[PDB]
Amino acid sequence: MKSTGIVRKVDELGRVVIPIELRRTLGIAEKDALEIYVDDEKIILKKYKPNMT
Amino acid sequence: MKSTGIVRKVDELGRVVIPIELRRTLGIAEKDALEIYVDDEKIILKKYKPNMT
């Protein structure tokens, strides 16, 4: 079980468990942020665009 | 402060806080499941397609 059509549980309010490999891909964790967008019948969440100069 | 390019915090291990309006769109919550797919540099979470007939 990795990604691409893999079933995960929610939590309560909405906190869905993102795969370690996925957050690893984004280089994010805990205190980091994601950019959540919506696509009709599904959710689209990218890592937040880091404003680092 | 709704969906569509909105920034959210993670948690630790990856549990990202899905908008109440989003989980509401999917009619999911807590005990429910999502189908997580990966899109290059982003994550795609659909609701788990319910096998109810």
CA-nearest residue to B9 within chain A is: A33
Burial label, A28 (beta-carbon count in 10 A; 0-12, 13-18, 19+): buried
| Amino acid, res. B47 | K
The alpha carbon of residue A43 and the mean position of all alpha carbons in its chain are separated, in whole angstroms, by: 9
Elucidated via: NMR
**Among the partner residues A3, A7, A46, nearest to B33 by beta-carbon distance:** A7
What does the alpha-carbon distance between residue B53 and residue B50 come to, in Å, rounded to a whole number?
9
- Confirm or reject contact between B36 and chain A (CB < 8 A): yes
CA distances for A11 relative to A15, A25, A49, B14, B28, angstroms: 5, 22, 26, 12, 10
Tell me the domains of chain A and their CATH numbers.
1-53 (2.10.260.10)
